[PDB]
Amino acid sequence: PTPLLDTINYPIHMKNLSVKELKQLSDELRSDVIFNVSKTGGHLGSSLGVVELTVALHYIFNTPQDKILWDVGHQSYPHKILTGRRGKMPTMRQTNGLSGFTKRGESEHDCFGTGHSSTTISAGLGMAVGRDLKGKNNNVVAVIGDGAMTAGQAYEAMNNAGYLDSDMIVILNDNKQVSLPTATLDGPSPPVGSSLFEELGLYYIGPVDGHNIDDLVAILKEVKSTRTTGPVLIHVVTEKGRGYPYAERADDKYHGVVKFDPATGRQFKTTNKTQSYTTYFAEALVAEAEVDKDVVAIHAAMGGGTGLNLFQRRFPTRCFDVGIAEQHAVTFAAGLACEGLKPFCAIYSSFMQRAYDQVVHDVDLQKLPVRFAMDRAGLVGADGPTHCGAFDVTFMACLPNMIVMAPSDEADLFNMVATAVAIDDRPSCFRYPRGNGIGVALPPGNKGVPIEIGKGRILKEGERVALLGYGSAVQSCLGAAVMLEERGLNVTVADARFCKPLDRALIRSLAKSHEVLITVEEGSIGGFGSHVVQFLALDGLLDGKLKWRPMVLPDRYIDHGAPADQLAEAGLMPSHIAATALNL
Amino acid sequence: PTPLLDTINYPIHMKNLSVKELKQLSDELRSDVIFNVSKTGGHLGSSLGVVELTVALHYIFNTPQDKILWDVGHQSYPHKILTGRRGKMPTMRQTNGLSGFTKRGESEHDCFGTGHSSTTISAGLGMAVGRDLKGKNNNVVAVIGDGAMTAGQAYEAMNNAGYLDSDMIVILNDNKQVSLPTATLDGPSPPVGSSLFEELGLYYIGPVDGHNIDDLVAILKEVKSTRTTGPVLIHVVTEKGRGYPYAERADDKYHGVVKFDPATGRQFKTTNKTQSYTTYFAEALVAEAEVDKDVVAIHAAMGGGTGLNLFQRRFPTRCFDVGIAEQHAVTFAAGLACEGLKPFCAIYSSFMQRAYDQVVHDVDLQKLPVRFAMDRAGLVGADGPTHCGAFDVTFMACLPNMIVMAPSDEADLFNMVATAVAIDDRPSCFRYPRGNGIGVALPPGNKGVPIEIGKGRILKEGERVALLGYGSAVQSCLGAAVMLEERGLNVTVADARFCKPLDRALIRSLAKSHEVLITVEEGSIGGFGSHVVQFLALDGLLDGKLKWRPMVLPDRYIDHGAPADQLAEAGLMPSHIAATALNL
């Protein structure tokens, strides 16, 4: 039922269209986005409410005349549609296909590749003053939602913009305060329920209704050609999930909606055999929150993506909502960790770097007791490297006073939470991937057994060759033997779950026993492989002369797509790990 | 002339004092602080204006009854005085002595060790809700200046506080908008010149005059016992430098005042033989800013501490003031770097982690052309590890698309700026220490010769043993030979200024030529030593079997004090480097 849209492949097509037909076009957009997302993994409800805006700021402002800036990129579906990427939606989020977010290095109109909240308005101000410095006379628009209004970059950049009076545009979203979040938020805590940022120096129009394209077109053409002087901010009323009567009351319930029935919203319940680690975490943390008084979890609006809703309404006063500000959290952790409490942070492995300051200074210099749950370890799969948190083992494990631990399955997951909630002399951190394993039940079913701080875990027997690693990697190390175990078990696998303090005893035993060793990790090369050889070096005076090759994330950003091929791309399908020893 | 102060060693002494004598006491405090700072290195003008407040919030609120929170800690001088640390001022900033900032791990009243701007109000809110969760009924006060009002943590934490209605106190400073900065700001750009924080939800009293202790005592006792409900923010009018008629018009000119004449303000001009690197940088950048159109430098209010005042008024439209928000800058860099410009960032090696998000995502995923000037590399000397930026080689050099360079002297400093301003296909970063060298003049005097990207630099001849390193370290490597060069020059020194892309050719040549190798760096162990062996490992198939021991910052936080002993403490005086090879 989409007449007008089969005609447009860039805004020049629609430049002369009228508002009456503009509305029908926006409706066709709703329908097309729904039919496209019903293939896979589309952050639906935002873009559903955003179709209107996409239309407006592709009609009024020309691109790449006007450098438009969107938010994180989840609601970039209509934009991509109207920017020569309608015919590629059956390949978005797939391998070799489109990223789920705006990606500068794709098309001439892909203005600035987003992928992290609030990280845009600053670059938009930058382009604004830069074009005013090259003498050019363009318009630069930054679109964000309230979800990006909470973080720091937004506040600081927008204040500085209102200061510089650089001619630029800002666009806020979601008047009803339902957020515009990170990629993998499965669900935030549902609420039951303006800016006057002129003190910050901007101009603040809206929130106007982002549900009548007539309104917006009568704005950006009417006032905001380059005649506009200085920066302007555009809040917009947007019913997230607008256009799909299921998500219209079930937005978060269809926000990160998997391939769903376009007629009933039906989704796949096939994952009910083994649960995700994020569920395997909030399921389990309550088994320490019930038996303890001051166990508190800290999250930056990654509840669903961390499962911690199993924790919040159970203990309505030991789970805290800080918005998406990883910095304010990690100290609000330490700020509680000085009260003798044991507040413990659940924050995505990539999203930690948002706060890497406080982890370095406000905690490890204070030695305060904060345990970190670095969710979404390394390869996130179908959301692009703008979530590939393959640095956690690098930026954390370099710090003194911090303990780095990563599971192997649901058992080790909570076999360690029984430790990192036990210890409160110092901080620690959890590096658990996103996926599945083989999980014995709660410490009821014997999984909450704390283990010695700094103690490794041999998981297999093998003497001609060694093997190490942690995070999702040891499962792949288990999987690494599949083409290896049938060779007399040359391989032993040692999930040395402690990255620092390392099981310096284990590695040492591993060292002299074998003639070769191969670590592996889901992080860039500043982490386990680095620390292990750093320890291998000094301990080396007992012949640190065994071949050692850290198969880490190669120096490149692995794109979106199928996690299995991401392993194949990143050289981390077991065969890659397998081949490494095979050369020896 | 200090009658009352020889009597007080904790606020319990002054609990019954009267306001008339309170003022005289504050005056005695001004005088004592001046006589103490005239020994060394005191961040004077703030604390000079802060004496009043220190008095008030040590009189009203009891400690450790009430967890008071100061700003970065520069104006902690009066606080320390009134907290059993008046008699230690002749040892503050020295080795084994006091830190120039509040340090939680020192005294029972040292509430939360600050050292980075805006990193406090969050921890203050944390303590507030925590004490309300332990049932305790205390008061938690956070004191900050406008200098901490700009950054992100402040905005986000204070919004979240106004949300949680947790009973807490916030204190803003410096009504006249003269800032409260980072430690080593030698001078900001001097300016010629109501704060609605109700949208942030808190309560905002002030700015009242922080120059009559009568005013403040009639406030915190009058309304802000625990009867106060929710969070409150206290702006205060404070003439920075109050009490010293020189700094009263020369605050920044006596802010980071070296041991000065308490009668005339005279300071030591003895440093006019060799200039600092920060001067050696802005002196030199203009030699590329004159011959180029879009060379722009970016700084977060570290002008004096980066010398970039040699750059600002020269090019009043190619140097930008962003406040102290390292995040908003590093993209405002990239946001300009997409306009084909070449905007280049000068930000302290420690203060980068404040923004490590954007360097990871908003730049290296965009491959935008931003060059970083990581000032204050590693050992900052007399300001404590709350500035020890010994992670820059770790968190940066792990990224793809980023080039890491560090000088050896003023020559290599600008021999590379001629490169990192030349290249704009990608980002890069400068790791220069704080100190001195041996500097030939500007590219006029032949120092602006660009060098091949990824090319090392052998600085000495030596074949039985190798040696590497960069930053301040290669000078120490030069200095390392002083007890080594007289041994037949076993040592060669190779300032392989490129950390990534490494001079993979040099290291390889170095490898087979020698039988031993020793890198060294001013960073924690996630950097050069890691990357070099990571490259040593894969290249190792040509016998990566040479002994290699990265003498990096040991896993500990090196305190304030004399830089030479910091080298001795951190195991980085040449003898330590010397001893390493001596074992072989």
Added chain:
Amino acid sequence: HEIKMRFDMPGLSKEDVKISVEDNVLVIKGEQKKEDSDDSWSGRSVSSYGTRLQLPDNCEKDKIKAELKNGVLFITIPKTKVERKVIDVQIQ
């Protein structure tokens, strides 16, 4: 301290904007709906919000400056100090 607020809002909608400046309470209903007449433009931009400015000092009446009701709302009204200073709310 003293109370101040300006509304840049070029083309401040003529739907509902209000000003009331008492002691430490203040209601500053700054609003840009654009629900029918954007500024004079065609738009069904259904919107809902108003502005609140309480004050952490009972706003006395020494100096008042106001420029408002068409495109801006801007008010400045004073006080300084003590007796239960709260803004945006007086929580129990």
